[PDB]
Design an enzyme around this catalytic site. Structure first.
Site, short mmCIF file in Angstrom:
data_model
loop_
_atom_site.label_atom_id
_atom_site.label_comp_id
_atom_site.label_asym_id
_atom_site.label_seq_id
_atom_site.Cartn_x
_atom_site.Cartn_y
_atom_site.Cartn_z
N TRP A 160 -24.30 21.31 47.15
CA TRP A 160 -25.63 21.84 47.41
C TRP A 160 -25.71 23.23 46.77
CZ3 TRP A 160 -22.46 20.39 51.64
CH2 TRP A 160 -21.76 21.44 52.25
N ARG A 174 -15.73 26.56 48.00
CA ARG A 174 -14.54 25.75 48.28
C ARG A 174 -14.17 25.67 49.75
NH1 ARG A 174 -10.12 28.16 44.47
NH2 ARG A 174 -11.69 29.83 44.14
N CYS A 198 -15.20 28.34 41.74
CA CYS A 198 -16.13 27.79 42.73
C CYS A 198 -16.11 28.61 44.01
CB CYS A 198 -15.79 26.32 43.03
SG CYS A 198 -16.85 25.62 44.30
N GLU A 234 -28.22 30.49 42.06
CA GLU A 234 -28.14 29.60 40.91
C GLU A 234 -29.53 29.27 40.39
OE1 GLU A 234 -25.06 26.44 41.07
OE2 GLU A 234 -25.06 26.85 43.24
C1 HEM Z 1 -20.68 22.28 48.43
C2 HEM Z 1 -21.36 23.30 47.93
C3 HEM Z 1 -20.95 24.03 46.63
C4 HEM Z 1 -21.39 25.25 46.29
C5 HEM Z 1 -22.33 26.14 47.13
C6 HEM Z 1 -20.81 25.59 45.02
C7 HEM Z 1 -21.02 26.76 44.33
C8 HEM Z 1 -20.62 26.98 43.04
C9 HEM Z 1 -21.17 27.95 42.13
C10 HEM Z 1 -22.34 28.91 42.44
C11 HEM Z 1 -20.48 27.88 40.99
C12 HEM Z 1 -20.77 28.77 39.75
C13 HEM Z 1 -21.08 27.91 38.53
C14 HEM Z 1 -22.31 28.43 37.83
O1 HEM Z 1 -22.78 29.54 38.15
O2 HEM Z 1 -22.80 27.71 36.92
C15 HEM Z 1 -19.47 26.83 41.12
C16 HEM Z 1 -18.52 26.43 40.19
C17 HEM Z 1 -17.73 25.29 40.27
N1 HEM Z 1 -17.73 24.39 41.32
FE1 HEM Z 1 -18.63 24.58 43.12
N2 HEM Z 1 -20.01 24.54 44.59
C18 HEM Z 1 -20.09 23.55 45.56
C19 HEM Z 1 -19.47 22.33 45.50
C20 HEM Z 1 -18.57 21.87 44.57
C21 HEM Z 1 -17.97 20.55 44.51
C22 HEM Z 1 -18.30 19.38 45.49
C23 HEM Z 1 -17.14 20.54 43.44
C24 HEM Z 1 -16.21 19.43 42.90
C25 HEM Z 1 -15.88 18.35 43.63
C26 HEM Z 1 -17.20 21.85 42.84
C27 HEM Z 1 -16.49 22.30 41.75
C28 HEM Z 1 -16.79 23.41 41.01
C29 HEM Z 1 -16.22 23.70 39.72
C30 HEM Z 1 -15.15 22.85 38.98
C31 HEM Z 1 -16.77 24.83 39.28
C32 HEM Z 1 -16.42 25.51 37.93
C33 HEM Z 1 -17.69 25.67 37.13
C34 HEM Z 1 -17.43 25.93 35.67
O3 HEM Z 1 -16.26 26.24 35.29
O4 HEM Z 1 -18.40 25.85 34.87
N3 HEM Z 1 -18.07 22.62 43.54
N4 HEM Z 1 -19.59 26.32 42.39
C1 LIG Z 2 -22.06 28.10 31.46
N1 LIG Z 2 -21.94 26.87 32.25
C2 LIG Z 2 -21.68 25.75 31.34
C3 LIG Z 2 -21.14 24.61 32.16
C4 LIG Z 2 -20.60 23.49 31.54
C5 LIG Z 2 -20.10 22.45 32.31
C6 LIG Z 2 -20.15 22.54 33.70
C7 LIG Z 2 -20.70 23.65 34.32
C8 LIG Z 2 -20.73 23.74 35.81
C9 LIG Z 2 -19.68 23.16 36.51
C10 LIG Z 2 -19.64 23.21 37.90
F1 LIG Z 2 -18.61 22.65 38.56
C11 LIG Z 2 -20.67 23.82 38.61
C12 LIG Z 2 -21.74 24.39 37.92
C13 LIG Z 2 -22.85 25.03 38.72
C14 LIG Z 2 -23.73 23.93 39.33
C15 LIG Z 2 -23.29 23.56 40.74
C16 LIG Z 2 -22.53 22.42 40.98
C17 LIG Z 2 -22.15 22.08 42.27
C18 LIG Z 2 -21.31 20.86 42.50
C19 LIG Z 2 -22.55 22.89 43.33
C20 LIG Z 2 -23.33 24.03 43.06
N2 LIG Z 2 -23.75 24.85 44.05
N3 LIG Z 2 -23.68 24.32 41.79
C21 LIG Z 2 -21.78 24.35 36.52
C22 LIG Z 2 -21.19 24.70 33.55
#
Ligand code: HEM
Ligand SMILES: CNCc1cccc(-c2cc(F)cc(CCc3cc(C)cc(N)n3)c2)c1
Ligand code: HEM
Ligand SMILES: CNCc1cccc(-c2cc(F)cc(CCc3cc(C)cc(N)n3)c2)c1
Ligand SMILES: C[C@H](O)[C@H](O)[C@H]1CNc2nc(N)[nH]c(=O)c2N1
Ligand SMILES: C[C@H](O)[C@H](O)[C@H]1CNc2nc(N)[nH]c(=O)c2N1
Ligand SMILES: [Zn+2]
Lengths: 411, 407
Positions: free
Chosen positions: A280, A111, A108, A285
């Site tokens: 947000w 963070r 993420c 994305e």
């Molecule tokens: C507040 C603004 C936030 C932004 C701008 C942001 C941005 C991102 C982005 C761009 C990704 C890449 C995932 C993808 O490309 O599909 C990601 C992954 C992730 N975010 Fe954030 N995020 C935010 C908030 C949060 C929050 C609130 C949580 C949990 C409480 C969180 C937890 C995660 C997790 C667990 C991943 C791993 C995704 C995965 O393994 O598929 N994020 N984040």
């Molecule tokens: C290849 N992805 C498969 C997959 C499966 C399960 C979960 C996710 C996934 C998990 C996340 F925490 C985040 C994302 C990106 C969407 C996202 C979420 C949030 C909270 C903020 C942000 N700015 N954007 C995607 C992705």
């Protein structure tokens, strides 16, 4: 032991001690790196050490390690485990755990915001209708008329794995996808399988290109039920370009609230299988992945045609040219409608400050370069030049199998 | 243990068995991934030679043959005697081609078998090295129809007699720190530009001055040589739309020729093994021109484009970046100098991967390096899972000579 990471643009070197507290495995070995691999019923036996380690972390963070409150809580959790085979987190512990699962999420980039997470306790929920009510309130709170606020809603933890709470949607708000008989897809190709499940479950699909999917909610291991999010709660943004008046005629929109609902939240060995969380969007994305992935809406060609670029040779970089304009349009539209969004330059710069701060106050920041670097203009963002160490800390968010693959249907 | 890699754009799944033949270590552990870290005696030698000879004779389908066993014995005799050994020309060519084949960070490996190997193991002096390098440059440049080549100087003996090219690339632009405070030319070469002046060079102090060669033979002090300008093919950079682009005064050289790596074949170490291919456009347009620690022209280009540079969210950097990289490709293509865009090169690499998985059982690949530095996810490699592991023969990094040379 100590580990150094170097930023090759600034020469700033950071020292990581936090990786020592890592126990879970990465997938890599001494002989193979699995860093680009997308994805590489728990008994009382292993549970109390997981609880103890979490409670040590919790009481350390509040400057009460070794206190009577700490020792009494350990005792209380121990007796609850051996007597009931599980235990319940206090409210303060749940909030701490959810914030730290985000803090620990090495993929993420957002963070820097981890400590301003709104935690909604839904552990008293018992039915799918109750889940729908909690999720609606989450969406309304998080959306905040475009001034988005991070939030997570936490449904009851797993017990024997046969009574799971699950949100079957991968995100709370997502567009339907429909496979046509001619082989083409209408709407979002990523959601064809889930759309077909909804339709089978009784959803009356409008069969348009941007149909907000219904919620499919599973309480207590029962068959999931369909609910329609009130449309007034689903904030959407029509996409226009600030210079190209024809861009609006592409008919594109997107929703404002990214809300992931298929992950599992692990806190002190407890497993929260339904824990939708939202923040947000970072602009890429939507503009890069959602719109321009070949396997998604795939609008590069239509945009490039309307820009009248040379599309015969790829070395004209017509794809790169159209990609930038599309991502300008996404950012322009959200800002013009006053819906929170962050561009990849701002987001990656904040992440570097966050990471440096984490190395100083915490001894490290686990980060997954493969995911942190944005999918366009990689090396003109500062994260590209930043060495990162990836390791797994708990509390954590984990992947879990899609529920339709494991669910035992009741009928 | 028989691993799968998935392409998430096409659902193509490949099964990797080649990694089980891997020997050296990645820097990663089960507790920590270091995938983004830039740089993580008589008895040791014979197993290394045996491993290499085994794969050589397997590749010519003579595993377990008379000639195989004879050569194994002969090298075994030579090591027991000389404490080293010499490669046959056939083995040297094989070792260098497979060092490239095994280079997990190289996107251009579909070409690996069409490498021209120049045997310079008879070289004894820096003047001789200069001569071999000039021939290499002329052969590889080929009037703009670039051809892959490597020139292999004598192998390390006792580490006191090393052959080294002190340049990081055969052709690079000088870098000067101004009294005014900033940097003229290439900032990445400020230190090496110093060591050239601090050794005898006479710098034009321009923005694109080709650096001289600093050549070390047999462990002696290195010597300066100017590469004949008629051997250094340069491309003036113009844009097929913006006439003001020419006035920026940009050019780049046609021949990327890495000269500071170490080639390991069968345990033997070749400390001087300059090799060259041809550029991917982003190496110049994205990294060389737009890195903040390099020529860093993004601001001036965006100014000339009159983009709104008040807010990052206008994506003015991204817009300028694209135009700069359109011009690099346009300039090389117009002057008939080989260059590949990142879309073509990554499509070639996906094709290379499927070939290597089919005919070899895998392909070690470093995603962090393979995905281009712009437009990552619109290239197919972004969606390609990759396994990274170390095979030998290999190219390895080695310390800069000025930190080691007993002067
Ligand atoms: C507040 C603004 C936030 C932004 C701008 C942001 C941005 C991102 C982005 C761009 C990704 C890449 C995932 C993808 O490309 O599909 C990601 C992954 C992730 N975010 Fe954030 N995020 C935010 C908030 C949060 C929050 C609130 C949580 C949990 C409480 C969180 C937890 C995660 C997790 C667990 C991943 C791993 C995704 C995965 O393994 O598929 N994020 N984040
Ligand atoms: C290849 N992805 C498969 C997959 C499966 C399960 C979960 C996710 C996934 C998990 C996340 F925490 C985040 C994302 C990106 C969407 C996202 C979420 C949030 C909270 C903020 C942000 N700015 N954007 C995607 C992705
Ligand atoms: C012929 C066309 C070639 C292309 C298009 C190409 C492309 C590239 C690119 C873009 C990189 C990334 C390096 C960077 O960004 O600085 C790279 C790395 C590398 N290339 Fe290739 N290359 C070619 C030929 C060769 C040849 C002929 C060899 C050796 C015989 C070679 C060996 C390597 C090695 C060892 C690396 C990684 C070195 C490191 O760790 O920095 N390449 N290549
Ligand atoms: C951050 N780099 C530091 C560093 C240090 C030492 C060597 C290298 C390096 C090694 C390589 F084999 C390749 C490169 C890119 C230059 C290059 C070389 C070739 C043959 C074809 C190509 N198209 N391009 C760079 C890079
Ligand atoms: C194969 C590769 O691991 C996969 O395509 C990853 C690459 N990096 C990513 N990075 C982000 N933020 N999101 C993604 O979906 C991916 N996909
Ligand atoms: C820190 C990070 O490993 C470093 O910036 C890498 C990233 N990927 C790269 N990829 C290529 N092809 N070339 C590079 O110099 C780098 N630099
Ligand atoms: Zn790894």
């Amino acid at each position: 032991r100590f580990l150094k990471v170097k930023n090759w643009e600034t020469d700033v070197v950071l020292t990581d001690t936090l990786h020592l507290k890592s126990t879970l495995e990465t997938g890599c070995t001494e002989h193979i790196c699995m860093g680009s691999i997308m994805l590489p019923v728990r008994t009382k036996d292993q549970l109390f050490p997981l609880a103890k380690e979490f409670l040590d972390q919790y009481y350390s963070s509040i400057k009460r390690f070794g206190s009577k409150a700490h020792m009494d809580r350990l005792e209380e959790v121990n007796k609850e485990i051996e007597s009931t085979s599980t235990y319940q987190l206090k409210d303060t512990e749940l909030i701490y755990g959810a914030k730290h699962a985000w803090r620990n999420a090495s993929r993420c980039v957002g963070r820097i915001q981890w400590s301003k997470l709104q935690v909604f306790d839904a552990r008293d929920c018992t039915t799918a209708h109750g889940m729908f009510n909690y999720i609606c309130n989450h969406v309304k709170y998080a959306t905040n008329k475009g001034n988005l606020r991070s939030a997570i809603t936490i449904f009851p933890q797993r017990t024997d794995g046969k009574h799971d709470f699950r949100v079957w949607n991968s995100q709370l708000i997502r567009y339907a996808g429909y496979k046509q008989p001619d082989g083409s897809t209408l709407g979002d190709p990523a959601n064809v399988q889930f759309t077909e499940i909804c339709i089978q479950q009784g959803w009356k699909a409008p069969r348009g290109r941007f149909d907000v999917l219904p919620l499919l909610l599973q309480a207590n291991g029962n068959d999931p039920e369909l609910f329609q999010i009130p449309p007034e709660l689903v904030l959407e943004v029509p996409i226009r370009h600030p210079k190209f008046d024809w861009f609006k005629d592409l008919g594109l929109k997107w929703y404002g609230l990214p809300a992931v609902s298929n992950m599992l939240l692990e806190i002190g060995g407890l497993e929260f299988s339904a824990c939708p969380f939202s923040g947000w969007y970072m602009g890429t994305e939507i503009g890069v992945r959602d719109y321009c992935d070949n396997s998604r809406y795939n609008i590069l060609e239509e945009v490039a045609k309307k820009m009248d670029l040379d599309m015969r040779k790829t070395s004209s970089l017509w794809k790169d040219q159209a990609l930038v304009e599309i991502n300008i349009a996404v950012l322009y539209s959200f800002q013009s409608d006053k819906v929170t969004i962050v561009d990849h330059h701002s987001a990656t710069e904040s992440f570097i400050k966050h990471m440096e701060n984490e190395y100083r106050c915490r001894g490290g920041c686990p980060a997954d370069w493969v995911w942190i670097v944005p999918p366009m203009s990689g090396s003109i963002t500062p994260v590209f030049h930043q060495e990162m160490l990836n390791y797994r800390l708990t509390p954590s968010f984990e992947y879990q199998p899609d529920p339709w693959n494991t669910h035992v249907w009741k009928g």
